Design a protein around this ligand. Structure first.
Ligand SMILES: C[C@@H](O)[C@H](NC(=O)c1ccc(-c2ccc(Br)cc2)cc1)C(=O)NO
Ligand SMILES: [Zn+2]
Length: 301
C-alpha cells in the first residue's frame, strides 16, 4: 500500500514584497526542511538568527493579523502563507524573512500557492500525521463563536455579519468541503479586505502602512472601490475561510474534522486551538498507511 507521506519543497522559493501593517520591504525565502520539522519561521536579518516554529504556543498578538513571537522577536501576518502551506499539504519548511512581517503580495494566498507549486513538492519517507477531532470543542466571546466538530474529512464553514449594502444575501455564509472543492480554485484567490472608515482610523494612527487597492479589497459605506471588481461573488467570506485555514495550521498538523466559525477572528481561532490542545480527550494523532482509505486527499506532488 501507498502511505500518505510528509511533504516539503522540492526547491528553494524566493519572493519579495511589502508588509501590510509595517509597510517595510521584505525578502521571503522558502526552503526544504527535514521530516518532523514542521513550518519554522526564521528572522535572517537578526544576529543571532531567530527561529520561530509556526505553532499555537508561539502566537503573540492577534489584533489584525496572526503574529508569532519569541522573546521580543516577531513575525507578523503569517496566516495567508500558512493557509497556502496547509492547502498544498506542506508539512516541513523553513520560512526565511529579512523583516518582521510576511509580504502581503496581492492580499490572498494565490501568489504563495503559485510560488510553491512552481518549485514543486517533495514527498518524504515518513508518514504524514493528522490530528483527528474526536469530540466537539467550542470557544465563544460575546456573539463570536468557533467550533471543532468530528467529521470524516476536512470542512470549513464561516459566517460574517456586516450591516452594509454590499453584504446582503447568501454571500455572508460559506461552507467548503475539501473532498469535492479545491482550496486552490475556490479559496486561494480570496483577498484581504478593509472598510474605508477603519482604514482612515488606521492611517490616522500610522498603522497598516503597506495597504492599498493593489493588495486588498477596499469598501466604503456603499461599494467596493477596486476598479476591477471581485474574484468571487462571496470573496469576503472566502477570505475569512482562507484566514481560518492558516490560523488552524498553527496546530502543526493537518486536521481531520470540521471547523465552524461565526464572526471569528485570529484571536478566537487561536483560543479554539489552545482549548483543543488542552483537551487531549477531544483529539488523536493518526496516520494512513493506505492512501485509498484516507478521508483527506492532497494533490499529486
Ligand atoms: C480581513 C481581516 O480579518 C484581516 N485584514 C485586516 O485587518 C486589514 C486588511 C486590509 C487593510 C487595509 C487595506 C487597504 C488600505 Br489603503 C489600508 C489598510 C487593513 C487591515 C485579515 O485578512 N487578516 O488575515
Ligand atoms: Zn487574511
Amino acid at each position: 500500500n501507498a502511505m500518505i507521506k510528509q511533504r516539503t519543497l522540492k526547491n528553494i522559493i524566493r519572493a519579495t514584497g511589502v508588509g501590510l501593517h509595517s509597510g517595510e520591504k521584505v525578502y521571503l525565502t522558502l526552503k526544504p526542511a527535514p521530516v518532523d520539522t514542521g513550518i519554522v519561521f526564521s528572522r535572517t536579518d537578526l544576529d543571532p538568527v531567530v527561529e520561530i516554529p509556526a505553532r499555537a504556543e508561539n502566537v503573540g498578538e492577534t489584533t489584525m493579523s496572526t503574529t508569532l513571537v519569541k522573546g521580543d522577536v516577531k513575525v507578523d501576518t503569517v496566516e495567508h502563507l500558512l493557509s497556502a502551506m496547509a492547502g498544498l499539504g506542506i508539512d516541513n519548511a523553513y520560512v526565511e524573512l529579512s523583516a518582521s512581517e510576511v509580504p502581503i503580495m496581492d492580499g490572498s494566498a494565490g501568489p504563495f500557492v503559485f510560488l510553491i507549486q512552481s518549485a514543486g513538492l517533495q514527498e518524504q519517507e515518513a508518514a504524514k500525521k493528522f490530528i483527528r477531532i474526536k469530540r466537539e470543542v467550542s470557544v465563544e466571546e460575546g456573539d463570536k463563536r468557533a467550533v471543532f466538530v468530528p467529521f470524516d474529512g476536512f470542512k470549513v464553514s464561516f459566517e460574517i455579519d456586516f450591516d452594509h449594502p454590499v453584504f446582503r444575501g447568501r454571500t455572508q455564509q460559506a461552507s467548503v468541503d475539501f473532498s469535492s472543492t479545491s482550496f486552490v480554485k475556490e479559496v486561494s484567490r480570496a483577498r484581504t479586505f478593509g472598510f474605508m472608515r477603519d482604514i482612515e482610523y488606521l492611517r490616522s494612527q500610522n498603522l497598516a502602512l503597506g495597504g492599498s487597492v493593489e493588495n486588498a479589497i477596499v469598501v466604503d459605506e456603499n461599494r467596493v472601490l477596486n476598479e476591477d471588481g471581485l474574484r468571487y461573488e462571496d470573496e469576503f467570506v472566502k477570505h475569512k475561510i482562507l484566514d481560518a485555514i492558516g490560523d488552524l495550521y498553527l496546530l502543526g498538523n493537518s486536521l481531520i474534522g470540521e471547523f465552524r466559525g461565526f464572526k471569528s477572528g485570529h484571536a478566537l481561532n487561536n483560543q479554539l486551538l489552545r482549548t483543543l490542545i488542552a483537551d487531549k480527550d477531544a483529539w488523536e494523532v493518526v496516520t494512513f498507511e493506505d492512501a485509498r482509505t484516507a478521508p483527506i486527499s492532497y494533490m499529486r506532488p
